[PDB]
């Protein structure tokens, strides 16, 4: 990766710190659907099978999971 200025380097590390913190603060169920969809690339159907719930429930669960994440991210200063 190219070299960044010192401030950029630190700020980005701070950000990764807070984002990680925000995800740790998710309930297990909210983190579970975010991990599967975004980090593992799974589809709602696949998440439905692995988790043991209806697909419609995977959708709504993700809706709440991301909105909760956002709340923490705002409180944390990461996003407005």
């Amino acid at each position: 990766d190219p070299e960044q200025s010192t401030p950029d380097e630190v700020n980005a590390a701070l950000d990764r710190l807070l984002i990680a913190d925000a995800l740790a603060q998710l309930s297990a169920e909210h983190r579970a659907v975010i991990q599967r969809s975004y980090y593992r690339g799974w589809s709602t159907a696949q998440i439905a099978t692995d988790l043991g719930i209806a697909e419609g429930t995977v959708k709504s669960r993700l809706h709440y999971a991301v909105r909760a994440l956002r709340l923490t991210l705002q409180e944390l200063g990461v996003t407005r």
Binding site: A12, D15, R16, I19, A20, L23, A24, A28, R31, A32, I34, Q35, S37, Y38, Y39, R40, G41, W42, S43, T44, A45, I47, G56, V58, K59, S60, L62, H63, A65, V66, R67, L69, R70, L73, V78, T79
Partner: protein
Amino acid sequence: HHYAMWDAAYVLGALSAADRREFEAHLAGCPECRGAVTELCGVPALLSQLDRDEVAAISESA
């Protein structure tokens, strides 16, 4: 309307290809959903700052 619940899935890339087109169609004529996705469009960018391994460690470690 069940669509309102699809915003996060859509923005996270988790909608099957058929659901994705259904939702994109709904979005063209639904200002509420449209504003919902707009609220979330910054989230994948933030999520992308961590790798799946870092994330898995956060889970195992709860």
